Ligand binder design. Sequence first.
Ligand code: YOE
Ligand code: YOE
Ligand code: YOE
Ligand code: YOE
Ligand code: MG
Ligand code: MG
Lengths: 206, 207
Amino acid sequence: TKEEAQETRAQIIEAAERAFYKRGVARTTLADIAELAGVTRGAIYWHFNNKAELVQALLDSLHETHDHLLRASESEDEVDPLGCMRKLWLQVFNELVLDARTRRIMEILFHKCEFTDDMCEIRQQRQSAVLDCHKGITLALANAVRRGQLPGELDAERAAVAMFAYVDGLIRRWLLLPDSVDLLGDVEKWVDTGLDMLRLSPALRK
Amino acid sequence: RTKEEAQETRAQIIEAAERAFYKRGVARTTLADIAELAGVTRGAIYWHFNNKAELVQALLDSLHETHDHLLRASESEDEVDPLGCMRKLWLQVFNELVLDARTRRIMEILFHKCEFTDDMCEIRQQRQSAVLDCHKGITLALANAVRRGQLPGELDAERAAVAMFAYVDGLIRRWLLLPDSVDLLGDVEKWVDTGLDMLRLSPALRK
Ligand SMILES: O=C1CC[C@@]2(O)[C@@H]3Cc4ccc(O)c5c4[C@]2(CCN3CC2CC2)[C@@H]1O5
Ligand SMILES: O=C1CC[C@@]2(O)[C@@H]3Cc4ccc(O)c5c4[C@]2(CCN3CC2CC2)[C@@H]1O5
Ligand SMILES: O=C1CC[C@@]2(O)[C@@H]3Cc4ccc(O)c5c4[C@]2(CCN3CC2CC2)[C@@H]1O5
Ligand SMILES: O=C1CC[C@@]2(O)[C@@H]3Cc4ccc(O)c5c4[C@]2(CCN3CC2CC2)[C@@H]1O5
Ligand SMILES: [Mg+2]
Ligand SMILES: [Mg+2]
């Protein structure tokens, strides 16, 4: 049955989040996740080959809320690629602080997920996700340069690395020390600080 | 002598813990495993460390020594060029990461092979303490540079410290995950200056 299968996969993913958040990925097994989800008869193995597929599902689930702002910032036909990128990072930070699911998937991926040789797909799939995002940020920065919103001589690739590094570090800083960063109250200041680096730093120019 | 032999054995244990944590991760590695790798008895390893968290803290603490003279130079009110010492500090941070196998392996362990779990809550708390401490230091050096006129007078030192640390921390982990994406050694001056340019030119980082 169609709906029941998606029914069950969502139960498993939701239970996987609870299990990974409590006990970490390394020591959690699929059998333990099936126990939390209330699924039996090997159902979990029909939806996932291994834990890495479950981790990838959680990582893929983050790309959904922002799909439209990603598309807009990457499109050559977009009139305001820089403004759309600003709206994107504003949404990324807002969802992190406001959404329990997002914050806790990211906490799982960043602080409860080990890169090991017996589970090499986790690091490899993290490399691919970061690389994919870098391509998107680089392309959106190149659209802003062409629109006259960023320096004509900007090194879009290095500026994409710089922006990602800043956003990445800020998120992890808020996850580790929520009290230290009023990410929600000053979200615009935090987004503009990184954008300002791309706009003004002479080091980021070719 | 007792002291010399114990310090010798402690170093063997720490070195073997790096090899064990790096290969199998912190969560599934036991002190018994580390003892076998280090070639010491289980009683020996348990004399030096009560649990796995204490060993992780040992690695986490060793990172502070190499930079200890440059962070205190930028932190000193009497430093004539605090902004300059900060630049040399971050240059040295990135230089050691790329050149030093040990520092790279430890940071890879701490950032990518060590889970925050209720089963070992000391890990997260020690990371919280280390970041909070570094934040204070960075805030000191930024206020000195502002007072010395090297940074904007109306700069929010607290937020600027956060932003600089976020950039450096994010860059480190990007190079750890994708080394060929960041020539962190040949362009090290560019990568440091990019973040310093952020604190010095961003109108958002001002009150
Ligand atoms: O972080 C890292 C960095 C180093 C490694 O990347 C590489 C291969 C690999 C593959 C998958 C992993 O999860 C993982 C590794 C690591 C295990 C050891 N290797 C080194 C050998 C390819 C040369 C580890 O953890
Ligand atoms: O791999 C990835 C894929 C997607 C992301 O790259 C970006 C921003 C970001 C910044 C730092 C991370 O460690 C991290 C992310 C990710 C979290 C959220 N995303 C924003 C864009 C997907 C909308 C994640 O994990
Ligand atoms: O990131 C975090 C933030 C939240 C927690 O900090 C605290 C206690 C704790 C202790 C050690 C951890 O490794 C760890 C946690 C967390 C697990 C449970 N929480 C208790 C409070 C959320 C109710 C987690 O991961
Ligand atoms: O990546 C890094 C590189 C530099 C540090 O490693 C060391 C000590 C430390 C300990 C735990 C961290 O999470 C952390 C750090 C860092 C914070 C402070 N440092 C001292 C070195 C700046 C002189 C940071 O972030
Ligand atoms: Mg979402
Ligand atoms: Mg050192």
